[PDB]
Design a binder for this molecule. Structure first.
Ligand SMILES: C[C@H](O)CNC(=O)Nc1ccccc1
Ligand SMILES: C[C@H](O)CNC(=O)Nc1ccccc1
Ligand SMILES: [Zn+2]
Ligand SMILES: [Zn+2]
Ligand SMILES: [Zn+2]
Ligand SMILES: [Zn+2]
Lengths: 360, 360
C-alpha cells in the first residue's frame, strides 16, 4: 500500500474514532459533532503532510532492513500513521492559536479558522485547545499497550513545551528584553541590538525545529523500536540545523514570494519580526542604511514597507542566502555521514528530509 | 506541618524548578524568566486553592489510617501537593483562555491577564498554553518513578479533554444546535428550546465538574495508592452532583452578588448564557413572562438586563433554589453513605468537600 493513501486512510479512521467517542462518552449531539468534524478537516488538512509523512518514511526505512511478520509490518505502519497525525494535529493547534495571536488573515489561501463566520475567536481558541487534546486521545487509545508509549508521550510533551517557549521568543522578539514587564505596555525596540544571529537562532530553534524536524524523526524511531540505531545528540543537531534552514527559507518567502503563491500576504516587516532578512541586513549595513531601516521597520504604512524591501534588495541578501545555504549543505552532509556509522537507513531518511527541504 | 503551608511551599519549589529548567535547558534569559514568573503568580495564585487542597486532604485522610514510614508519609504529602498544583495550573490555563474568549474584564478583583498592559492577547493565549504545558512538566519530573504515573496522566488527559468539550458546550449554549455551521454567522436562539435542565446539566458536567471535583478526588486516591478503597462509579456520581450544585451557585451569584464581592461585574444575561436562573425561570414562566424574557435576554442594554433581573425576582427563584438545594443535600448524603461501605475515610473527605461547597 502506498504511504500517502495509508496515511489518509488513517486520518479517516482516527476522525471516526474521535467523533464516535464524543457520542458514546461525552454526550455530544450530531450538530456539534459535525462542527468538530469540519474544524478538524479545515485545520488539519490541505498541507503537504511533511511532518506526519516523515514518521511514516522513517518507519518504512527500518521495515526494509528488519525481520518481522506481515502483521507486525502493518502494525508498525499504522502506528507511524497515528504518530504522524499526532504531529499534524499538534501543528494545527499551534497554527490556529498563532493565527489568532498574530491577527492573521489567511493561511493556505483560505481564511484563518477564527475568521470563518460561524467560528469567531471565542470558539476558535477552544477549538485549538481541542486539537491538541486529540493528540493525547489518539496516543492513549492506539498505543495503550505499546512499549514505546511512555517515551513517545514524554518526548511529545517536551516538544510541545519547547514550541510554546519558542512562540514566546517569537512574539517578544521586537521588544527590548530589559523592558519586558506585564505591568507596562511594550515599546518596539529602537536600537535593534537584539537582532543578532544567536538570538534569531534561539527563536527558530524552539518555535519550529522541535516540532517540524526533531519530533517526526524521533517518533519514526520510537514506533520502530529503533532508538538504539542512533546517537540522539546527532539527531538533535541535524534536526536543529535543517529546521533553521527551513525557517530562513520561510522568512525570505514572507518578503519576496507573491501572495497567491505564499497562500498569505506576508507582514513580517510591519510586525517587526526578527527575520533572517532583518538580522542579515543589519549585519552588513552601513550607518546610513541602519538609520533608514530604523525609520521604516515595524510600520503598517506601505510606503515604509516598500523602503525596507528596497533596502533588502540593494543589500544583495541573495548572496548572503547562497552563502548560508552552502554552509548548511556542508554541515547537513557531514551529520548524515556521521549518522551512517550507526544506521545507513536512518541516515538515508535524513537525506530525504534534507532533499525535501532543500528543494522547496 | 500544616497543609496549606506545605502546599504553598511546594508552589515555590515547583516554580523554582520550572524557571531553573527554562534557564538550563531552554536557553531562557533572565527577563523572560521574570515575565513567566510573574505570569505564573498572577494566574495561579490568589484563589482559595480548593482544588489543589482537596488532593492534599484526601491524602491526609488515608495517611491517618495506613501504616507507613515517616519518609513515605512525606513523599505522599509532597506528591499530593504537586498533583494539587497540576490541577490549580490546569484551572489557570482555562481561566486565562476563557477570559480571552469571553472578553472578560476582571477576575478576583484584578484585570484579566490578557488586559495587563505588557501582556496583550497575543502573549496571553500563549501564556495560557504554557500554563497547561507546565502541568505535564511537573508530572514527568516529580512522578517519574511512581507507580501511579500512567494512571495519573491518563486521568488528567481525560479530564482536560472533558473540560474543553464543556467549554464548547458553554460557548454554543445560546445558539440553536441545528444552525451550528462554521460557514454561517451564528444567530442567538429566539425560541430558547434548548434552555432545558438536561442541556444545562450537560454543559456544567463537562465544563466544570470533571476538573473541579472529579480530578482532585481521584488524584488524592492515586497518589495514595487507594483507588481500591472506592467504587469509581460512586466517585463519579458524587463529583458530578456536587459540581453541578457549585455551578448553580455560581450562576445565581453572577446575577445577584454585588460586583465588589463577586470579584467580577456579572454579564451572563447580556451574554445570553444558559444559566440555572434562565432555565428555572423558563420552566415556570407563563406565556407573557416567556415573551418578556425573549424581548430582553442577551442584550447589552442595561434597561433590558434590569427587566430580566426583575423577571427573575418576581418568579421567586429563591424557592426553586431551596428546593434544588434540598434535593442535592439528600442525594449527596446518600452517596456519602454508599462510599462508607468501602471507605469511611474517603467518605469523610467527600463530606468535607460537600461542607465546603455548601457553605460558600
Ligand atoms: C506553503 C508551505 O510552506 C508549504 N509546505 C511546505 O513547504 N512544507 C514542507 C516541505 C518540505 C519540507 C518541510 C516542510
Ligand atoms: C469567588 C470564587 O468563587 C471563590 N472560590 C471558591 O468559592 N472556591 C470554592 C470553595 C469551596 C468549594 C468549591 C470552590
Ligand atoms: Zn506568530
Ligand atoms: Zn513566516
Ligand atoms: Zn466562558
Ligand atoms: Zn459564572
Amino acid at each position: 500500500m502506498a504511504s500517502m493513501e495509508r496515511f489518509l486512510s488513517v486520518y479517516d479512521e482516527v476522525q471516526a474514532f474521535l467523533l464516535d467517542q464524543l457520542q458514546s462518552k461525552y454526550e455530544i449531539d450530531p450538530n456539534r459533532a459535525r462542527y468538530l468534524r469540519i474544524m478538524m478537516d479545515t485545520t488539519c488538512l490541505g498541507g503537504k503532510y511533511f511532518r506526519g509523512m516523515t514518521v511514516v518514511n522513517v518507519a518504512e526505512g527500518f521495515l526494509a532492513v528488519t525481520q518481522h511478520d506481515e502483521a507486525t509490518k502493518e502494525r508498525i505502519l499504522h502506528d507511524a500513521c497515528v504518530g504522524g497525525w499526532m504531529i499534524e494535529f499538534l501543528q494545527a493547534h499551534y497554527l490556529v492559536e498563532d493565527d489568532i495571536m498574530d491577527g492573521s488573515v489567511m493561511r493556505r489561501g483560505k481564511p484563518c479558522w477564527y475568521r470563518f463566520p460561524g467560528v469567531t475567536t471565542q470558539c476558535a481558541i477552544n477549538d485549538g485547545i481541542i486539537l491538541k487534546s486529540w493528540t493525547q486521545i489518539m496516543a492513549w487509545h492506539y498505543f495503550a499497550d505499546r512499549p514505546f508509549l511512555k517515551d513517545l508521550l514524554c518526548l511529545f510533551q517536551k516538544v510541545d513545551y519547547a514550541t510554546a517557549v519558542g512562540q514566546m521568543y517569537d512574539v517578544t522578539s521586537m521588544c527590548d528584553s530589559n523592558k519586558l514587564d506585564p505591568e507596562v505596555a511594550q515599546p518596539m525596540t529602537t536600537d535593534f541590538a537584539e537582532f543578532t544571529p544567536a538570538i534569531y537562532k534561539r527563536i527558530v530553534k524552539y518555535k519550529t525545529t522541535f516540532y517540524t524536524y526533531l519530533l517526526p524523526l524521533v517518533m519514526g524511531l520510537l514506533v520502530s523500536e529503533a532508538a538504539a540505531s542512533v546517537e540522539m545528540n546527532l539527531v538533535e543537531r541535524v534536526a536543529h540545523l535543517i529546521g533553521e534552514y527551513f525557517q530562513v527559507q520561510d522568512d525570505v518567502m514572507d518578503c519576496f514570494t507573491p501572495p497567491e503563491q505564499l497562500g498569505k500576504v506576508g507582514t513580517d516587516i510591519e510586525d517587526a519580526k526578527c527575520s533572517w532578512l532583518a538580522v542579515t541586513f543589519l549585519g552588513k549595513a552601513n550607518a546610513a542604511q541602519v538609520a533608514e531601516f530604523k525609520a521604516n521597520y515595524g510600520e503598517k504604512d506601505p510606503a515604509k514597507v516598500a523602503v525596507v524591501k528596497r533596502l533588502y534588495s540593494k543589500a544583495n541578501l541573495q548572496a548572503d542566502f547562497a552563502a548560508y545555504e552552502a554552509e548548511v549543505v556542508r554541515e547537513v552532509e557531514s551529520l548524515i555521514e556521521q549518522l551512517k556509522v550507526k544506521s545507513p537507513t536512518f541516515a538515508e531518511s535524513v537525506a530525504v528530509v534534507w532533499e525535501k527541504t532543500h528543494k522547496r
